[PDB]
Amino acid sequence: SYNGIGLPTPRGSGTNGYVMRNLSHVKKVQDPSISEHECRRQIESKLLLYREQLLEEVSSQHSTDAAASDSNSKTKSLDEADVEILVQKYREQLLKELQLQKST
């Protein structure tokens, strides 16, 4: 009749119910480093896109300079020479990764 303890009614038994508490109850790293290498090459690609943005800014500067010369639209500074300096940076970062591997 309370918390699952007791009998439904004292009638029918020789007792009065009156349940009591027991009063004696005992209440007691990463293995495939290829992931990091891929992350490094990916951050290299992010830097590549960042330098492409810088090249676009340089192209805007060139367009402004050409407009000023005309006074005295949008153009592109370098269509393909940026790919050669990009390959140079590729060589540079490959040297960096070789040096890092040698250091480890």
């Binding site: 009749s1 309370y2 007791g6 439904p8 009614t9 009638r11 119910g17």
Partner: peptide, 11 residues
């Protein structure tokens, strides 16, 4: 049965 309240037959 709440321990302060009445007790009835099961019904």
């Amino acid at each position: 049965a709440i321990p302060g309240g009445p007790k009835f037959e099961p019904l």
